[PDB]
């Protein structure tokens, strides 16, 4: 199937409380594999998946060096952005950054990303062609002009179409057991008498990977989207995910309702029914 690799960076200024916080995390698909935390004791890029631990000292020393270079840029960015918007030194502000690449089912380059946000809003982003920039407001256009003159997009495109996908393939082959796996959802239903004339039917999906899934209810085959309580897909904490969908059915109508599960790990979609 298709695969992706993403790096997420968060930088939070701490007025009066010293250095800004800085957290970087790396993902392959829905699996985190590296992390760096400015407040933690090691001051190193650290493994978060077992299949990245076999990487040697050169990998860790180089990723540590580069992640520090990300941190230093974000430390400067907070001051720079504070000036662009004429904000005081007393308030805390947030910078976020994300970049990475998508590969299709042929494992060739499909899409590349580099996005930047200030205080929860889009600031500047690389366009799909990996050659131009989208700048949200007037301040962002000053950054856009700076990055155009310095040919920042030229270097990013080379990283996204080259290095990013090459190391994505390497991670996929090295962590084959973890990353090229699919865990089908384990499914069950619960039935709880809310009152004497209606009951809650809840369709569970457990222990699945990757996170993408479709959980829906039908009544006589008709979609119940507006009448279904759907929770956000949530991590189990062991690398799998969970989700459920519930519907309130009048007593004696349970046989009308079917729950439908679509997931990559299933040989074919599931139709469940309380009976």
């Amino acid at each position: 199937g298709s695969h992706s690799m993403r790096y997420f960076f968060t930088s939070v200024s701490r007025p009066g409380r010293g250095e800004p916080r800085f957290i970087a995390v790396g993902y392959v698909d829905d699996t985190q594999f590296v992390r760096f935390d400015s407040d933690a004791a090691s001051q190193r890029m650290e493994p978060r998946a077992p299949w990245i631990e076999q990487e040697g000292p050169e990998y860790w020393d180089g990723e540590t060096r580069k992640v520090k270079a990300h941190s230093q840029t974000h430390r400067v960015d907070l001051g720079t952005l504070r000036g662009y918007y004429n904000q005081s030194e007393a308030g805390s502000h947030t910078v976020q950054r994300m970049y990475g690449c998508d590969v299709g089912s042929d494992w060739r380059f499909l899409r590349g990303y580099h996005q930047y946000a200030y205080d929860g809003k889009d600031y500047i982003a690389l366009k799909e062609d990996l050659r131009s920039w989208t700048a949200a407001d007037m301040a962002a256009q000053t950054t856009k002009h700076k990055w155009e003159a310095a040919h920042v997009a030229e270097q990013l495109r080379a990283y996204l179409e080259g290095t990013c996908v090459e190391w994505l393939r390497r991670y996929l082959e090295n962590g084959k057991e973890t990353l090229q796996r699919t865990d089908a959802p384990k499914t069950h239903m619960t039935h709880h008498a809310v009152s004497d004339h209606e009951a809650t039917l809840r369709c569970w999906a457990l222990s699945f990977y990757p996170a993408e899934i479709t959980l829906t209810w039908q009544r006589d085959g008709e979609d119940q989207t507006q009448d279904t309580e759907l929770v956000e897909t949530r991590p189990a904490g062991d690398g799998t995910f969970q989700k459920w969908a519930a519907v309130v059915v009048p007593s004696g109508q349970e046989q009308r309702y079917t729950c439908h599960v679509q997931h990559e790990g299933l040989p074919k979609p599931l139709t469940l029914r309380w009976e």
């Binding site: 790096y7 790396g26 990998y59 180089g62 990723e63 580069k66 992640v67 270079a69 990300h70 840029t73 400067v76 960015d77 720079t80 952005l81 970049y99 930047y116 600031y123 500047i124 950054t143 700076k146 990055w147 310095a150 920042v152 270097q155 990013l156 990283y159 290095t163 990013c164 190391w167």
Partner: peptide, 9 residues
């Protein structure tokens, strides 16, 4: 792996 170049805004 991370990108090696990180331009400041």
């Amino acid at each position: 792996i991370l990108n090696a170049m990180i331009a400041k805004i």
